[PDB]
């Protein structure tokens, strides 16, 4: 009877897995790995935050890193967070990593996971996952329909700290908890499957019915 499980905040709690990124060292070409922050990534959390229109919240990321065989070793890692608008690291050794304004967390591989919080980064008063219109003001003469830059939440990048290359191979499960959630002007929740990642597009020929059929209308199971 306690209402607290149905509040809009509890419904988005419970940090889940929002992405996974792999890392391998040849040392030069790709010695790093980058992951843009997108909560549309998987279909469970996407379908939940697409039943609303405007949402305002905080993010809390936890980085679980292991090796390919799985057994750790005390190598040091660097998690760089490039806030929206900053250039992304173009290489393991690039000068991007020494930028002071890109926060970082140096944590050894054998430690408990590293954890950080992100504020609400938009210039707008809330995120909006449904935008009807065009981003450009330049009188679009008329694929750019629906995509608003406002929702860029930034990016993480990962490297191994060392002077030479270490031949280990890593993958990083990144769990995201969603805090202080406010939500507005709800929508209906999607019946049809998703096709393209960032767009509502669906399949017109294959449309699936919302309710599984039965024998006859006047016979109830």
């Amino acid at each position: 009877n306690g209402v607290l499980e149905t509040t809009i905040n509890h419904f988005f709690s419970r940090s889940g897995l929002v992405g996974v990124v792999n890392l391998t060292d040849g040392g030069d070409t790709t010695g790093y790995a980058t992951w843009d922050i997108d909560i549309m990534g998987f279909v469970q959390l996407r379908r939940k935050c697409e039943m609303f229109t405007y949402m305002r919240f905080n993010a809390e990321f936890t980085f679980v890193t292991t090796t390919k065989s799985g057994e750790a070793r005390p190598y040091m890692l660097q998690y760089m967070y490039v806030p929206p608008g900053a250039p992304k690291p173009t290489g393991r050794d690039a000068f991007q990593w020494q930028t002071a304004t890109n926060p970082s967390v140096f944590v050894k591989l054998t430690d408990p996971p590293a954890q950080v919080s992100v504020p609400f980064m938009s210039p707008a008063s809330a995120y909006q996952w449904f935008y009807d219109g065009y981003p450009t003001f330049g009188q679009h003469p008329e694929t750019t329909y629906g995509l608003c830059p406002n929702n860029m939440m930034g990016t993480f990048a990962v490297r191994v700290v060392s002077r030479e290359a270490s031949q280990l191979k890593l993958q990083t499960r990144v769990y995201m908890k969603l805090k202080h959630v406010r939500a507005w002007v709800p929508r209906p929740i999607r019946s049809q499957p998703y096709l393209l990642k960032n767009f509502p597009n669906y399949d017109s020929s294959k449309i699936t019915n919302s309710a599984r059929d039965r024998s006859s209308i006047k016979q109830a199971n």
Binding site: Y131, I189, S191, S204
Partner: protein, 216 residues
């Protein structure tokens, strides 16, 4: 006039202390009526669009860089007592149509054309209304501010909607705040000899308007 739907239980207001066109923009605009018949699949109007190219309201919106307002919408359906059917009149914020006819790639995915996204004054027509062309379940469209116009009962539907958006001001040409969806849930039926096609008239009053950033 029996029942008005007041969207989200909140009245339009001005900027919470950017100019106001006095009472100059206050008057009814009556769109070309839509002709509803047995096979009609529904219609929609991207709203801060419909008025963009027509009227004194239209000259302001095209010549001003920022825009704010709410609306009052009246949907009337004239028809006899021998006609029957029902329509679902709903105002759904940030209505975004979708590419259908699936081809899933980064490249050839069939995005909608501009004439399909922003229909203009004459509105547009749903290919398959069952999903509202959003991929979403119309049977749940009753979430939004809505009214049933049922020929058996009262034939009018009125809905007041406040200005809603994440920002106080936004462009009138590029961004369409809310769409207006009219669907024929239960199909129109009539006996032989009755008038075949029933008109649908939508009147819209841009109450409580603001503009800014005029362009000479």
């Amino acid at each position: 006039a029996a029942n008005i739907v007041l969207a989200y239980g909140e009245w339009p207001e001005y900027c919470p202390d950017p100019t106001r066109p006095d009472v100059s923009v206050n008057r009814f605009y009556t769109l070309d009526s839509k002709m509803w018949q047995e096979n009609s699949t529904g219609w929609y109007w991207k709203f801060p669009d419909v008025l963009n190219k027509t009227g004194v309201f239209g000259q302001n919106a095209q010549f001003h860089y920022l825009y704010r307002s709410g609306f009052c919408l009246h949907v009337q359906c004239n028809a006899s007592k021998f006609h029957q059917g029902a329509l679902l009149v709903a105002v759904i914020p940030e209505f975004v149509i979708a590419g259908r006819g699936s081809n899933t790639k980064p490249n050839e995915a069939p995005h909608p054309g501009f004439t399909t996204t922003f229909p203009g004054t004459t509105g547009a027509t749903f290919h398959d209304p069952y999903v509202l062309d959003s991929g979403v379940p119309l049977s749940q469209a009753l979430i939004y501010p809505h009214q049933w116009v049922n020929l058996r009962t009262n034939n009018c539907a009125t809905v007041i909607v406040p200005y809603i958006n994440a920002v106080p001001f936004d462009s009138a040409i590029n961004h369409s705040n809310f769409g207006l969806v009219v669907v024929p849930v239960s199909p129109l039926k009539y006996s032989s000899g009755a008038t075949t096609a029933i008109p649908i008239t939508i009147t819209i009053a841009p109450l409580n308007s603001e503009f800014g950033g005029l362009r000479q």
